């Protein structure tokens, strides 16, 4: 009895030939709800593009669904939580648009530097205004790449062949990886100061949103050309218009908008700003690749094989014993990354005690997901480790030990720095509810909920420090839910971790740092 | 017509079952020269242990030989040069003895700490001298591992479960790799000062020979127990005896001797020194593994597949266009390693110009072989990259570019540091003789033979520096064959590289460093 | 028109002639300019004039249509060769000065 693969959006049979001859492939008009709901009961797999919405209704109606595959990068049209909730593997095609997007960033940079649209318009109005235009030459210039994921990397490679010097800002690429690319890693401030061109290649996360605001725009070089074909809003639209109009930034190119569909932007009134309706992946080659990618993911998944491009966890993929640990270990990765001075070159995950008897490779992926959350979009839960290692230069391993010193099971995440220094964070689960607990940081033991807004301070001025901190926080109106503090075993230092009911305003953070003479002050949300 | 695999030493059919049913396996008495020479003409592969000598005579007599496989680690009984000379792949079983050797190091450490042989002897002489003995407890002690290759790593893992703290000396393991192992990397001087136990796990290279001499022995902790089951002579035998007799080192264990067979060592007159006749790999399990390893290498090799455990280059393995580049690129790796402040985390090999059209992956291996020469034994030419990466923490990649700026072909080796700093060295070949030339170091261009003893100096005091250096060298009687020197483009520094006809005595090196205020002074042999 | 690929070599090849002259003990009886590699696909006559002009400046108290008549009346014959084949550099120019005694 051949497995049924239901295609609910416009993917050609040829596009999806990677599926074997071992499946029955059917098509449905996905956007038509009645049709979809009638066709899906029999489906073992469902492929979709962007037009079909794979909500809970669809899922409830598909009792033998094993995979939802989105032929694209976004997951807006799929409820991944509901799919995980029902043991359905969700997959996308995460690298299918990279060349088309890189090429479009370059397209936009050149189109802005040489005013292609306006010039084309003048000739289109049957006049010859050659004398009016003045372009900007790329050769010899410095180009700032803000975000060095896959696409930012391709843009740097292409722009470098124009004879431009490439610098980048990305706290999430190792220095050795950047050096292998022949790219100079910079603070954002230094990139701003130095760059004649800026191309943004960040994901949208609240760490990222409106990164380049007016404050940032004012630090750039006069004459900068700035391109964003990444995510709407990374560059503050109104601040750009201001800077464009004022003359300070010569030109810009945008493919994405704070909200789209966008038809009313003031930027649309500015000639020196080239704009395209989110076309970065609007390419036959990218749409075909999205399809052949996802056709292979669906093959592997039906072959009981391992699915690299998986986005979540669904099925036998993970035991009931292990499953609750995924989220805890993700939080340990977040924590180890925050407590680290810079990006670790690797994570060692040690699994000890009873849990060590389980199959726990997924825990290695959780740690990495946590470490990299600032550059990962929420829907995704799994990330491709080999790709992460090759793209960003960071690896993870798992080690097991039969014995856990205190709790019946503990997981330790060791974040190791290029200089051989190590940051260690541990958690357990226990109890009828399996509450997640952080139980160690760097040789100090305690028992704190792995949840909420946590403030962590390493500091040097000790006496009355508890009072100073709690008094500043409480004057700011901030509740302190739980706390852990200890004076360092060796040295003048001390450390404290507090769970708060809200974030800490910057001025008050500055006040606290000043009050106890902090060398490290961080606020991390563990929810 | 089934391929013939000739076994010339004592390997059982079962040991070699990894060979398919697609081969004819025959046996011969290898040590019997007449038999061997009569049997080998028909052989496609030859497996050997240690008793058969595979010299040029054997090779000349075996016209269709494709592989010589040594079931073991050593290659003393095989002329690898002659085999390469005739296009014969040589293979060993490089990891077959690691567990037996680690276990034997531990065996020797315990046997020495608790005086097992002497005690066993007293009971063997039918007396009870319990009151006479006094052992040393490992728990809580610091153990110094000198050399952190595979075996030193296993010893550290086993000794750590005894509750010992582990430190190591190895300039050829990254700090991040050591930190992943939970091992503290130390200067040799600091290891000496700190260690209650010392286990040596170096290869024999002239970088290594007699490493632990009297000077070193005198820096150790009073009461040290020292074990060498690595290579004869790493610990100076007479200096040990002195230190043992004098009482400063309490006990030692040795499995290997400056020259063996060894029957007359003074150490044999010392009870507090446990000795074994090179037994580290004398185990059925290790001999069986050596065989099953090598049986698989021979399978892969006959299957036209890739042979990880290859020791040299033989056959189609490498084009005639590429072949001469192997040795040059090895020398670039040596050079990039010497010019580096510490071990690079990776090597980027850039191949540019005409050579870029060739298949050049082997060049990546050459670079690594060069970088690691101080811990690689001469016979080996190829090393296993994946194993090197996992064991020591260093990787290599190849990049091609159509264009070479000046020479028709150039290879650049970029040694990248964990901090993102980069050392670059380039060479070409050209001419009827294809002479090997070093043509660039860190953005400075020149044309110097890649051969002989080269002295390299980075220094800060510039005027008359050429005179100072050449005068010191020539007063020492040292001829200067060739030279390259330039004042840094930016900064107070300058650099010079000289080819000399001999090494530079330490005092004179000290004098030169002092004379020009050097910050880096190195002497490397590129022959 | 001197080709854009050739123009940058004018000054270099002049310096080679200067060098070849100063390094010559006697005044050379012949000068040979050998162009090899990629440059050999270009029009490089003018490189012979540059060499000669370098040669004679390093000797005489010299322009471009001056030098061939100056060379003649000093008994220096010139020669220019072009070959696609270069053993090392993509393009290289050799300036060869031979003295009356057969020295090179």
As beta bridge partners, residue B415 has B347, B423
- Is C71:C56 a contact under the CB 8 Å cutoff? yes
CATH of the domain at B437: 3.30.1330.90
Residues A441, A339 contacting (CB under 8 angstroms): yes
**A363 and A262 housed in the same domain:** no
Q: Are strands B4-7 and B24-27 parallel, antiparallel or unpaired?
A: parallel
Which of A348, A416, A420 shows the shortest C-beta gap to B185? Answer: A420
To which residue do tokens 């072009």 refer? C82
Residue A66: CATH number of its domain: 3.40.50.720
DSSP string, A186-224: --HHHHHHH-SEEEE-PPPSTTTTT-B-HHHHTTSPTTE
- Contact call for residues B274 and B251 (beta carbons, < 8 A): yes
Domain co-membership, A394 together with A271 = no
- Domain end among B258, B287, B318: B318
SS (H, E, C) A260-320: CCCCCCHHHHCCCEEECCCCCCCCHHHHHHHHHHHHHHHHHHHCCCCCCCECCCCCCCCCC
Domain closes at, from A278, A304, A332: A278
Chain C closest-CA separation from residue B313 CA (Å): 27
Phi-psi region at B9: left, alpha or beta (left = phi > 0; alpha = psi -120 to 50): beta
Helix (H, G, I), strand (E, B) or coil at A428: strand
Strand partners, B276: none
Q: How far apart are CA A503 and CA B187, in angstroms?
A: 45
Q: Are B95 and B154 in contact (CB under 8 A)?
A: no
The alpha carbon of residue A356 is apart from the nearest alpha carbon of chain B, in Å, by 17
Whether residues A162 and A274 fall in one domain: yes
Which residues, listed in sequence order, are joined to residue B441 by a DSSP beta bridge? B425, B444
| Pairing of the two strands B89-91 and B67-70 | parallel
State both tokens at A242.
Answer: 């201001």
Distance in angstroms (rounded) separating the CA atoms of residues A157 and B81:
42
Question: Do A382 and A286 fall within a single domain?
Answer: no
What's the order of all strands across the beta sheet hosting A518-525?
A480-487, A494-500, A453-459, A518-525
Asked if residue A420 lies in contact with residue A397, where contact means CB atoms within 8 angstroms, the answer is: no
Resolution, given in Å to one decimal, reads 2.4
* Cα B470 → chain centroid: 34
Quick check: B407 and C88 CB within 8 A? yes
Q: Which residues pair with A414 in a beta bridge?
A: A348, A424
Helix (H) or strand (E) holding B301: helix B284-302
Catalytic residue among A278, A444, A449, A458: A278
Q: How was this structure determined?
A: X-ray
Any bridge partners for residue B394, and if so which?
A: none
Specify which residues C80 forms β-bridges with: C33
CA B413 to chain CA mean position, Å: 20
Q: What DSSP element (H or E) covers A6?
A: strand A4-7
Tell me if the bond preceding A261 is cis, omega within 30° of 0: yes
Residues A228 and A105 both lie in one domain = yes
Do the beta carbons of residue B302 and residue B21 sit within 8 Å?
no
**Pair B274, B285 in one domain:** no
Q: Please report the number of interchain residue pairs, chain A to chain B, with beta-carbon separation below 8 angstroms.
A: 52
The β-bridge partners of A143 are: A166, A197
Give the span between the Cα atoms of A166 and A141, in whole angstroms: 9
- Return the SS3 of B274: strand
CA distance C16 to B514: 40
Is A480 a known ligand-binding residue?
Answer: no
Residue whose C-alpha is closest to residue C23's, from C90, C99, C76: C99
CB A367 within 8 A of CB A350: no
Of B47, B44, B114, B50, nearest to B77 (Cα)? Answer: B50
Residue A260 appears among annotated catalytic residues: yes
Q: Are residues B244 and B287 in the same domain?
A: no
Residue B404: its chain C contacts at CB < 8 A? 90
Question: How many domains would you assign to chain A?
Answer: 4
- The one catalytic residue in A70, A231, A407, A414 is A231
B312, B353 contact by CB (below 8 A):
no
B with C: how many residue pairs have Cβ under 8 Å apart? 16
DSSP state of B329: H
User: From the centroid of its chain, how far is CA A68?
Assistant: 21
Task: Nearest by CB to B176, from A179, A185, A420: name it.
Answer: A420
Residue span of the structural domain in which A405 resides: 319-451
Whether residue B19 is annotated as binding a ligand: the answer is: no
Does residue A53 have a cis bond before it (omega within 30 degrees)? no
Question: What separation, in Å, do the N-terminal and C-terminal C-alpha atoms of chain B show?
Answer: 44
Return the structure tokens found at A300.
Answer: 């592997």
Q: Which residues of B touch C90 (CB under 8 A)?
A: 353, 404, 406-408
Task: Output the six-digit token pair for A188.
Answer: 């954002």
Whether chain A lies against chain B with 3 or more Cβ pairs closer than 8 A is yes
Burial environment of residue A297 by CB neighbours within 10 A (0 to 12, 13 to 18, 19 or more): buried
The residues, ordered by sequence, that sit 6+ positions from B263 with a Cβ below 8 Å of its Cβ are none
Q: Are residues B261 and B136 both part of a single domain? A: yes
Do both B143 and B12 map to the same domain?
no
DSSP B2: P
CA-CA distance, A507 to A498, in Å (whole number)? 18
| Phi, psi dihedrals of residue A320, rounded to the nearest 5° | -75, -20
- Could you tell me which of C3, C97, C81, C5 has the C-alpha nearest to residue C36? C81
Name the strand (E) or helix (H) holding A411. Answer: strand A409-416
Chain B residues inside the 8 Å CB shell of C87 = 430-431
Burial status of residue C44 (CB atoms within 10 A of its CB: 0-12, 13-18, 19 or more): buried
CB atoms within 10 A of CB B143: 25
B115 with B256, same domain: the answer is yes
Whether residues A359 and A303 share a domain: the answer is: no
Kindly state whether residues B142 and B246 are assigned to the same domain: yes
């Amino acid at each position: 009895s051949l497995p049924v693969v239901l295609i609910a959006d416009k993917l050609a049979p040829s596009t999806v030939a990677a599926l074997g001859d071992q499946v029955e492939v059917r098509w449905v008009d996905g956007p038509d709800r009645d049709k979809l709901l009638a066709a899906v009961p029999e489906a073992d797999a469902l492929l979709v593009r962007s037009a079909t919405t794979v909500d809970a209704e669809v899922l409830a109606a598909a009792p033998k669904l094993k995979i939802v595959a989105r032929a694209g990068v976004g997951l807006d049209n799929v409820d991944v939580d509901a799919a995980t909730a029902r043991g359905v593997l969700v997959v996308n095609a995460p690298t299918s648009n990279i060349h088309s997007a890189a090429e479009h960033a370059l397209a936009l940079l050149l189109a802005a530097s040489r005013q292609i649209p306006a010039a084309d318009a003048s000739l289109r109005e049957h006049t010859w205004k050659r004398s009016s235009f003045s372009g900007t030459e790329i050769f010899g210039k410095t180009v700032g790449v803000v975000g060095l994921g896959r696409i930012g990397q391709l843009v740097a490679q292409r722009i470098a062949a124009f004879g431009a010097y490439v610098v980048a800002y990305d706290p999430y690429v190792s220095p050795a990886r950047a050096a292998q690319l022949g790219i100079e890693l910079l603070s954002l401030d230094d990139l701003l100061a130095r760059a004649d061109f800026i191309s943004v290649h960040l994901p949208k996360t609240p760490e990222t949103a409106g990164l380049i605001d007016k404050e940032a725009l004012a630090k750039t070089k006069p004459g900068v050309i700035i391109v964003n074909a990444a995510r709407g809003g990374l560059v503050d639209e109104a601040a750009l218009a201001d800077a464009i109009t004022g003359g300070h930034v010569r030109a810009a190119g945008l493919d994405v908008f704070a909200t789209e569909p966008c038809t009313d932007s003031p930027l649309f009134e500015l000639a020196q700003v080239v704009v395209t309706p989110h076309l970065g992946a609007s390419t036959a080659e990218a749409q075909d690749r999205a399809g052949t990618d996802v056709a292979e993911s669906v093959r592997l998944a039906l072959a009981g094989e391992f699915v690299p491009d998986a986005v979540n966890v669904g099925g036998g993929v993970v035991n009931e014993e292990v499953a609750p640990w995924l989220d805890l270990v993700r939080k340990l990765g977040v924590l180890a990354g925050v407590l680290s001075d810079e990006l670790p070159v690797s994570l060692s995950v040690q699994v000890r005690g009873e849990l060590a008897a389980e199959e726990v490779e997924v825990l290695r992926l959780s740690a990495l997901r946590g470490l990299f959350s600032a550059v990962i979009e929420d829907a995704v839960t799994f990330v491709n480790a080999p790709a992460l290692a090759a793209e960003r230069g960071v690896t993870a391993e798992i080690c097991k030990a039969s014995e856990s010193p205190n709790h019946r099971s503990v997981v330790d995440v060791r974040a190791v720095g290029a200089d051989g220094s190590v940051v260690t964070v541990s958690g357990t689960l226990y109890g009828p509810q399996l509450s997640q607990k952080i139980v160690q940081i760097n040789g100090r033991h305690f028992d704190l909920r792995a949840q909420g807004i946590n403030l962590i301070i390493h500091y040097v001025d000790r006496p009355g420090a508890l009072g100073k901190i709690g008094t500043l926080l409480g004057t700011a109106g901030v509740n302190i839910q739980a706390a852990q503090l200890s004076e360092d075993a060796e040295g003048p230092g001390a450390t404290i971790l507090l769970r708060l009911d809200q974030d800490v305003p910057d001025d008050v953070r500055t006040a606290i740092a000043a009050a106890v003479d902090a060398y490290k002050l961080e606020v991390v949300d563990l929810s």
